[PDB]
Design a protein that fits this description.
This is part of a larger assembly, with two copies of chain A (250 residues).
Chain A (H helix, E strand, L loop, with lengths): L10 E5 L7 E4 L11 E2 L14 E5 L25 E4 L12 E7 L3 E2 L3 E7 L16 E3 L4 E2 L6 E8 L1 E3 L3 E7 L16 E4 L3 E3 L5 E8 L9 E4 L4 E2 L5 E2 L4 E4 L3
Antiparallel strand pairs in A: 1-2, 1-3, 4-5, 4-6, 7-10, 8-9, 8-11, 12-15, 13-14, 13-16, 17-20, 18-19
Chain lengths: 250, 250
């Protein structure tokens, strides 16, 4: 039918095959078609973003300073074919020609007060504070809050804060050379021990091992152990790479 | 038949295939149809919301400041394709075109005076008090009362208040790092003990374990126990990670 026939917050792409300038006809209206405004698709609803949600739209539209959707000399929509635009809660924005929906509408990303997101940047970019973000930096999203899902970052995994009970410690194994909470250089595979009571939130590098509990030392017993390598114990005694000594209640 | 023929609080969608501006014709009347007001469905009743009930309507209608159902330049109803509207007790509101009923009319949500709802937000939003609600926060609906079923929140489970009899205690296991009723940081898996007599309402994080009863200590007997880890008992005595001592009537 030559008459195209639109519901209210709907829009269709008219294929002006005198120019193929496919342009969104934001409804609603009894738009009339010559074969210079050829309709492409159906009156399907094309749902929008509910509050505090996000949708991933392929090939978004380039926007000027006033956030206006630009058109070129022939009237075709100015696109970002090789970009992405994270659309938060907003009106039923017209899907301009080229604008494809990669990910349909999805709920926002939530972290529990003691979980963390391994926020891996996939693409080099600059954060809002604007200091530096390398193409693949690792930074840990903190506890209670909500992250804004961006196109340049990827949530590889959710990191549950492993719990360090008293008389228990976490055998942390870094897989890259870096620092720790205390501040001494932690190298790859160097298993170190943190005794801070609580739910020690693992960093981007700490591979969590088993929770080692403190052995039980009454005056009836003494722990006979061998040092695997040079270090200084909690009491402040230098020990060699295999010297066997006793730790007691004293 | 060219005559459409409506009962009183009924309404039908007329498909103006000169514009397909499907618009609700709120009855009742002897509306007459050219093929520019094409009827879509039947005089089926389309029940409304009884008092203190709620219905979930897909694709609700956008409303202005005066809560008027808007129309666009061609007269098609202004919809919220990507939103929800919780309809409380109200009149037989016209189901405008696009407006679908996700959940049919259902009774309101009730909590017994000592049950609780694990109110999980599915979507990021702001509560009525307006401080902050992250996308997936956990807050416990309290006792005797009624919650308003919202689109942004989900009742995962009903939480029966587990009962702590005297000489009994609850072995609470948090699965996230957080605080407790007393106020000390409770980390994941750290089983702690609450001795407050009553029906201790479990929090959003407390996984309830078995109810441990107080052992029976007459002067005839003494409880010989070993401490699993460093702590301070109720009497205020530091105990090591395996020191075995006796607790008596004294």
């Amino acid at each position: 039918e030559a008459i195209i026939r639109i519901p209210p917050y709907h829009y269709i792409h008219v294929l002006d095959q005198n120019s193929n300038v496919s342009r969104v006809e934001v409804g609603p209206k009894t738009y009339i078609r010559q074969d210079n405004e050829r309709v492409l698709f159906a009156p399907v609803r094309m749902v929008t973003v509910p509050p505090r949600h996000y949708c991933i739209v392929a090939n978004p539209v380039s926007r000027d300073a006033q956030s206006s959707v630009l058109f070129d000399v022939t009237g075709q929509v100015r696109l970002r074919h090789a970009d992405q635009e994270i659309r938060l809660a907003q009106d039923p924005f017209p899907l301009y020609p080229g604008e494809l929906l990669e990910k349909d509408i999805t709920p926002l990303q939530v972290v529990l007060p003691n979980t963390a997101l391994h926020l891996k940047a996939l693409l080099d970019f600059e954060d809002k504070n604007g200091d530096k973000v390398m193409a693949g930096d690792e930074w840990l999203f903190e506890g209670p809050g909500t992250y804004i899902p961006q196109k340049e970052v990827e949530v590889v995994e959710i990191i549950q804060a492993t719990v360090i009970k008293q008389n228990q410690a976490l055998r942390l194994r870094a897989r890259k050379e870096c620092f720790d909470r205390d501040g001494k250089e932690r190298v790859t595979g160097e298993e170190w021990l943190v005794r801070s009571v609580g739910a020690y939130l693992p960093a981007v590098f700490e591979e969590v091992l088993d929770l080692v509990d403190a052995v039980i030392l009454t005056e009836k017993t003494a722990l006979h152990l061998r040092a695997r390598q040079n270090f200084k114990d909690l009491r402040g005694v230098a020990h060699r790479t295999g010297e066997e000594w006793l730790v007691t209640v004293q």
